[PDB]
C-alpha cells in the first residue's frame, strides 16, 4: 500500500524555489545532508548514554557515501536515530513551515540558498541536484518506511519490504542528468573536505568497481 500526501503549501513553495532559482553553488546539498546525519547520530548517542539497549539495533555510528554511476544515484547512509512514519510525514523531522518562512524572509533581505541549513530545512537542498529523492528509515520505535518525492507537490510513504537496515536513514539521490559530477570520487572528496571537516563521525566514501 502506497500513501500519497500533499506537501504543505509553504514546503511546495520552498521546493519550487530550490528547483527554479538560478544558483550555481549546488554542492552545499551534501553538507546539509551530512549535517542532518550527524544530528541524528548525536540523538541516538545521547539516548544510549542512559539506555545502552538503544544500540541493540547497531553499535556503529557512521556515515557512508555511496555513488553508483550505473543507477545515477548518490546514497547517504547513516546509523543515526532514524525517523518514525509520523516524522517522515511531518517534513522529515523538521518544523519546515516556520523554517521556510524565515528562510524566505532572509532571502528577500539578501541571504542566499547556501544558508538554508540555518533555517532547519536543509534536507530540501537535495533538490538542487536530484530529480527524485527516496528516504529509507528505521527508528527503534517503528517499522522501516520509504518516503519518496519528485517534487510536483506530493510525496509518498510506504512500509519498506527492501533490504532491512538495523537503524538509521538512507537518502538516495536520483541525480539530474547534468549533475553527475557528484558521483565522481575527487569531487565528493573535495566537498566533504571543504564543508564537513568538523563532523564527529567517520565519513566513508565508497568506491566503485
Ligand atoms: O531525527 C532524525 N532522525 N533521522 C534524521 C535524518 C533526517 C534527514 Br532528512 C537526513 O538527511 C538524515 C537523517 O538521519 N533526523 C533528523 C531530521 C531533521 C534534522 C536532523 C535530524 F537528525
Residue numbers in the entry: 16 to 224
Task: Please give me the paper's original passages concerning this structure.
The main difference between the structures is the conformation of residues 104–111, which can adopt either helical or loop-in conformations. All ligands occupy the ADP-binding site and form typical interactions, which include hydrogen bonds of the 2-hydroxyl group of the resorcinol ring with the side chain of D93 and with a water molecule that generally mediates interactions with G97. Similarly, compounds 2–5 were assigned as loop-in binders based on the similarity in size of their R1 substituent to compounds 1 and 6, for which crystal structures were determined. Interestingly, there is a strong difference in the binding thermodynamics of loop-in and helix-binding compounds.
Here we report the investigation of the role of protein flexibility in the modulation of binding kinetics and equilibrium thermodynamics of drug binding to heat shock protein 90 (HSP90). The N-terminal domain of HSP90 (N-HSP90) contains the nucleotide-binding site, which has been the target site for drugs interfering with ATP binding and ATPase activity. The unbound N-HSP90 has a highly flexible lid segment comprising residues 107–14137.
